Amino acid sequence: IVGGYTCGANTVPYQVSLNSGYHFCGGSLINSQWVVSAAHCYKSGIQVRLGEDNINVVEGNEQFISASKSIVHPSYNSNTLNNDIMLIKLKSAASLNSRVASISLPTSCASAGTQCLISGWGNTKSSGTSYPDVLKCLKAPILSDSSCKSAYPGQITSNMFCAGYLEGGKDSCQGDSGGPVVCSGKLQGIVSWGSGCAQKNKPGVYTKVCNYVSWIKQTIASN
Template identity: 70%
Template sequence: SLQVRLGEHNIFSNEGTEQFISSAKVIRHPNYNSRILDNDIMLIKLSSPANLNSYVKTVSLPSGCAAAGTTCLISGWGNTLSSGTNYPDLLQCLNAPILSENDCNGSYPGEITKNMFCAGFLAGGKDSCQGDSGGPVVCNGQLHGVVSWGYGCAQRNYPGVYTKVCNFNSWIQTTMSSN
């Protein structure tokens, strides 16, 4: 089983806010395609309930799909260098805009499915990276994306690609209620 760490901030020191809960079940999307990374989403059922407090909170599912230009917060403990390796101790955060379908398809022709969107900066310099995958993209307090893939990290004209959570609302709700 997986161990889920909640309330984490500095992954190398115990700050007293963490909760460690093992997974009871890991549910991959039935149509996940590892070759093209379509339907890149999964759910983890905890073996015991999380204790919600000021360090551990839930995030809302999206009420609709977010528009291009919406600013979102992307976070993780992934690599902070585009060439080379530096994994940080502290949770890193980036404010980044959702890009238009046109820009996204222009960067990755033929590779973007209806279940993906791009976010970040075509100029490069700021992006999610290895070690951030599976992490959240939160826009206006709602979970709109999951860190999925990209070409390198923070490269010019190659923004990050994210799972489009709004397309999976019903799968998430159905799966949660039946498990």
């Protein structure tokens, strides 16, 4: 997160870190056994880390649970990032509490202008590189579809939305991939892609979760 603020420990209780020897992506806990992330975060050997603040220090609220199954969206295209969503099942159910809690799925899509909370452990610099230990947060509005498409000619599908600031300076970045965009207490986006980070006229692009609720629910119901 570039231009954000320190969330505060366990104030984003649905935020997970995906770990394969190191943090490599975010995700969102959606029930005691399932995490939603980006398809571009797919790899083998995932341990889901819940209850994290400092990802380098055991602080006492963590739960570390290995993934038993990953399901990349059937229509994910890794060249265009269309359908950039994946589900991860935990080998055992997380113990839910005030600091480890699921985020509700949307019942409706969110509109341009809605304020959302984007969070992660990604790079905090737009030029140069600095990776934080503690979770970073950014409040950002959903941008209109027309401004999103104008920012990224030929690249924005109906499964994507932009959020952020066209003036630059505030954005998600490398390592925030797969993490949550939460608006009015619902998971509306997944950190997907952008051109650089926090660049003028190049806001972050996010997977439009509301399009996937039926797939998520039916997948969970049979897996």
